[PDB]
Structures are given as structure tokens and as C-alpha cells.
Amino acid sequence: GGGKVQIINKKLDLSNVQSKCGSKDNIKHVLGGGSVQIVYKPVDLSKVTSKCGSLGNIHHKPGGGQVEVKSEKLDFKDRVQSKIGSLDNITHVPGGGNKKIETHKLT
Amino acid sequence: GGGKVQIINKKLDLSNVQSKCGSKDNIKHVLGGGSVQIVYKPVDLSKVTSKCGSLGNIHHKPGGGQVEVKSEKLDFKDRVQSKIGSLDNITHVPGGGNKKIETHKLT
Amino acid sequence: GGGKVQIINKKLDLSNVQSKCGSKDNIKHVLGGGSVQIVYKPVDLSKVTSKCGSLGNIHHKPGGGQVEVKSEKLDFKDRVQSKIGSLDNITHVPGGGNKKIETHKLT
Numbered sequence A, B, C: 001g002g003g004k005v006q007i008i009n010k011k012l013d014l015s016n017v018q019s020k021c022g023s024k025d026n027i028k029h030v031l032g033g034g035s036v037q038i039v040y041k042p043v044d045l046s047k048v049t050s051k052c053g054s055l056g057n058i059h060h061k062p063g064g065g066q067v068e069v070k071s072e073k074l075d076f077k078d079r080v081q082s083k084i085g086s087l088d089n090i091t092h093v094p095g096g097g098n099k100k101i102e103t104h105k106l107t
Helices: none
Strands: A004-010 A014-019 A026-031 A036-040 A047-051 A058-060 A066-071 A074-076 A079-084 A099-106 B004-010 B014-019 B026-031 B036-040 B047-051 B058-060 B066-071 B074-076 B079-084 B089-091 B099-106 C004-010 C014-019 C026-031 C036-040 C047-051 C058-060 C066-071 C074-076 C079-084 C089-091 C099-106
Touching: A004 A079, A004 B079, A014 A026, A026 B014, A036 A066, A066 B036, B004 B079, B004 C079, B014 B026, B026 C014, B036 B066, B066 C036, C004 C079, C014 C026, C036 C066
Parallel strands: A004 B004, A014 B014, A026 B026, A036 B036, A047 B047, A058 B058, A066 B066, A074 B074, A079 B079, A099 B099, B004 C004, B014 C014, B026 C026, B036 C036, B047 C047, B058 C058, B066 C066, B074 C074, B079 C079, B089 C089, B099 C099
Antiparallel strands: none
């Protein structure tokens, strides 16, 4: 019907939508924003088997992982100006819905 | 019906949509934004078997991984200006919906 | 019906859409934005077998991987100006919907 003005400003957003879905529909394992996920799952299956013999000393000292994530600066110096004159629904106005705008910006 | 004005400003966004989906439809394993995912899953299956013999010392010291991710600066100095005069739905106006605009910007 | 104005400004975005999909339709393993994914999955299956003999010392010290990702600067100094005069739906106006615009920019 009437006039619309839509301004949308998004930065680091994440949406996940499931509309009118049937069966076993899924949205999994999503990272958005400045997100960080770290999965540290080393598996050690090293085996030492000795049978009917001599074995010396065992020094089982595996290294661990190092993981480093760094983020230094986020700055949102954002402006949204929206200057609208009018959204007027004039209806059934005999004799007139006349507009007069006068502007004098002197400097 | 009436006039529309749509301004959309997106930067680092992530959307995932499933509309009118049937069965076993999926959206998996998505990274957006300035996202970081680190999966550290080393598997060690190194085996030492000795049978009917001599074996010396064992020094099982595998190195670990190093992972480094760095991000230094995000700056959003963004402007959106939207200057609209009018979105007027004049209807059924005998005698007139006359507009007069007068602007005097003197400097 | 009425006039439309659509301005879209996107930078580093990621969309994934599944509309009217049937069965087992999937969107997997997507990276967007300035995203970083690091999968560290070395597999060690090195084996040492000795039978009916002598073996000395074992020094199993494999090196780990090094992974380095660096990003230095993101700057969004972006402008969107949208200057629209009018989106007027005049209808059923006997005698006239006359417009008069007068502009005097003196400097």
C-alpha cells in the first residue's frame, strides 16, 4: 500500500534458517563472526611388544601441539544517515492536499 | 503498491537457508566472517615388535605440530547516506495534489 | 506497482541456499570471508619388526609440521550515497498533480 524505506546494515552476522522443512534436514558445524574453534584430539596408539627376549628402557615422551590464534583490533566507526521528507498517504481529498516547501540555508 | 527504497549494506556475513526442503538435506561445515578453525588430530600408530631376540633402548619422542593464525586490524569506517524527498501516495484528489519545492542554499 | 530503488553493497559475504530441494541434497565444506581452516592430521604407521636377532637403540623423533597464516589489515572506508527526488504514485487526480521544483545553489 504505502511507501516503504528499508535500510539494512549488517557487519559480522550469522543467520541459519530452516523454513517449511521436511525430515532430517539439518544445519551443522557453522562458524561465523570472527569465531575461533580449536579441536585438539591427538590419538596415540603407539605400542611396544616384547616376547621371549630382552628390551631396554623406554622413554615415551611425545611432544604436545601448540596452537595460537590472535586477533588485534575491531573498530566500528560506522554511520547511517537516513533523511526522508514525507511518506504521506493522501486519499479522498477534494480541494487538494497541496504541499509547499520553502528552505533558505544561508551561511 | 507504493514506492519502495531498499538499501542493503553487508560486510562479513554468513547466511544459510533451507526453504521448502524435502528429506536429509543438509548444510554442513561452513566457515564465514573472519573465522578460524583448527583441527589438530594427529594419529600415532608406530609399533615396535621384538620376538626371540634382544632390543636396546627406545626413545619415542615425536615432535608436536605448531599452528599460528594471526589477524591484525579490522576497521569499519563506513557511511550510508540516503536522502529521499517523498514517497506520497496521492489518490482521489480532485482540484489537485500540487507540490511546490523552493530551495535557496546560499554560501 | 510503484517505483523501486534497490542498492545492494556486499563485501566479504557468504550465502548458502537450498530452495525446493528434494532428497540428500547438501552444501558441505564451504569457506568464505577471510576465513582460515587448518587441518593437522598426520598419520604415523612406521613399524620396526625384529625376529630371532639383535637390534640396537631406536630414536623415533619425527618432526612436527609448522603452519603459519597471517593477515595484516582490513579497512572499510566505504560510502553509499543515494539521493532520490520522489516516488509519488498520483492517481485519480482531476485538475492535476503538478510539480514545481526550484533550486538556487549560489556559492
